[PDB]
Motif scaffolding. Structure first.
Motif, PDB file in Angstrom:
ATOM      1  N   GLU A   1      -2.278 -42.524  23.898  1.00  0.00           N
ATOM      2  CA  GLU A   1      -1.700 -42.644  22.540  1.00  0.00           C
ATOM      3  C   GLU A   1      -1.817 -44.084  22.106  1.00  0.00           C
ATOM      4  O   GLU A   1      -2.066 -44.973  22.894  1.00  0.00           O
ATOM      5  CB  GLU A   1      -0.230 -42.258  22.515  1.00  0.00           C
ATOM      6  CG  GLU A   1      -0.098 -40.802  22.915  1.00  0.00           C
ATOM      7  CD  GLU A   1       0.810 -40.685  24.141  1.00  0.00           C
ATOM      8  OE1 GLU A   1       0.527 -41.344  25.128  1.00  0.00           O
ATOM      9  OE2 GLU A   1       1.771 -39.936  24.074  1.00  0.00           O
TER      10      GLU A   1
ATOM     11  N   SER B   1      -1.427 -43.013  17.977  1.00  0.00           N
ATOM     12  CA  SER B   1      -0.891 -41.877  18.788  1.00  0.00           C
ATOM     13  C   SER B   1      -1.975 -41.274  19.678  1.00  0.00           C
ATOM     14  O   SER B   1      -3.137 -41.619  19.603  1.00  0.00           O
ATOM     15  CB  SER B   1      -0.390 -40.778  17.897  1.00  0.00           C
ATOM     16  OG  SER B   1       0.594 -41.289  17.004  1.00  0.00           O
ATOM     17  N   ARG B   2      -1.584 -40.339  20.504  1.00  0.00           N
ATOM     18  CA  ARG B   2      -2.553 -39.652  21.393  1.00  0.00           C
ATOM     19  C   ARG B   2      -3.685 -39.146  20.534  1.00  0.00           C
ATOM     20  O   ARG B   2      -3.543 -38.218  19.763  1.00  0.00           O
ATOM     21  CB  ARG B   2      -1.901 -38.463  22.082  1.00  0.00           C
ATOM     22  CG  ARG B   2      -2.729 -38.047  23.302  1.00  0.00           C
ATOM     23  CD  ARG B   2      -2.637 -39.115  24.399  1.00  0.00           C
ATOM     24  NE  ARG B   2      -1.338 -38.990  25.119  1.00  0.00           N
ATOM     25  CZ  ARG B   2      -0.825 -37.810  25.345  1.00  0.00           C
ATOM     26  NH1 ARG B   2      -1.154 -37.158  26.425  1.00  0.00           N
ATOM     27  NH2 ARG B   2       0.015 -37.281  24.494  1.00  0.00           N
TER      28      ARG B   2
ATOM     29  N   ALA C   1       0.478 -46.096  24.302  1.00  0.00           N
ATOM     30  CA  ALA C   1       0.480 -45.608  25.699  1.00  0.00           C
ATOM     31  C   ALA C   1      -0.660 -46.294  26.402  1.00  0.00           C
ATOM     32  O   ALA C   1      -1.569 -46.783  25.766  1.00  0.00           O
ATOM     33  CB  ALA C   1       0.286 -44.107  25.731  1.00  0.00           C
TER      34      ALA C   1
ATOM     35  N   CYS D   1       3.680 -46.057  26.850  1.00  0.00           N
ATOM     36  CA  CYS D   1       4.358 -44.998  27.675  1.00  0.00           C
ATOM     37  C   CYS D   1       3.989 -45.069  29.168  1.00  0.00           C
ATOM     38  O   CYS D   1       4.815 -45.441  29.976  1.00  0.00           O
ATOM     39  CB  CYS D   1       4.044 -43.609  27.108  1.00  0.00           C
ATOM     40  SG  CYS D   1       5.469 -43.003  26.167  1.00  0.00           S
TER      41      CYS D   1
END
Length: 174
Positions: free
Chosen positions: A99, A103-104, A168, A172
């Motif tokens: 992400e 985002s992912r 991420a 994350c």
């Protein structure tokens, strides 16, 4: 100290295996026909040269494919770095599922896996191989070299991506 090697891939004479024109082609995003098989369709990968050493190639059995991610792996990528040791292989496109501030959205990345120990043919060659692979890496997403399996480090990939604006890899997971 005079050497006398061949005259082709010694000074860089590779030409993409064609499957590499599919390597970039894959490791993209939702392009997965259906990712439930795509997962096992080869979508992450390392490559090298050829039998006589040329075309960006699969000199062995490297390659992640997004599906494994969650078996011997789990979505990061250092496992894939493990696929590539140091004595054999240098260009790799691994479906990057990460992400970002966006985002992912999965964005694979070019890997010039160039170990300080690999064979010369995978150093003097890649020098000009990144032009051949490039002619097929229309969109590399991330030209990322690594002369240590740590330059591949997802935290560092979380710098090549997490060094600007992701969420991420740098957020994350790392």
């Amino acid at each position: 100290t005079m050497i006398t090697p061949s005259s082709g891939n010694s000074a860089s004479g590779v030409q993409v295996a064609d499957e590499v024109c599919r390597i970039f082609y894959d490791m993209k995003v939702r392009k997965c026909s259906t990712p439930e098989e795509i997962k096992k369709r080869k979508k992450a990968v390392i490559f090298c040269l050829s039998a006589d050493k040329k075309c960006i190639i699969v000199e062995e059995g490297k390659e992640i494919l997004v599906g494994d991610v969650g078996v011997t792996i789990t979505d990061p990528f250092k496992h894939f770095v493990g696929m590539l040791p140091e004595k054999d292989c240098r260009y790799a496109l691994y479906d990057a599922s990460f992400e970002t501030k966006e985002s992912r959205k999965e964005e694979l990345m070019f890997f010039l896996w160039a170990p300080e120990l690999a064979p010369l043919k995978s150093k003097m060659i890649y020098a000009s191989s990144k032009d051949a692979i490039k002619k097929k890496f229309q969109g590399i997403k991330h030209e990322c070299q690594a002369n240590g399996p740590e330059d591949l480090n997802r935290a560092c990939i979380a710098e090549k991506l997490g060094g600007s604006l992701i969420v991420a890899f740098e957020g994350c997971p790392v």
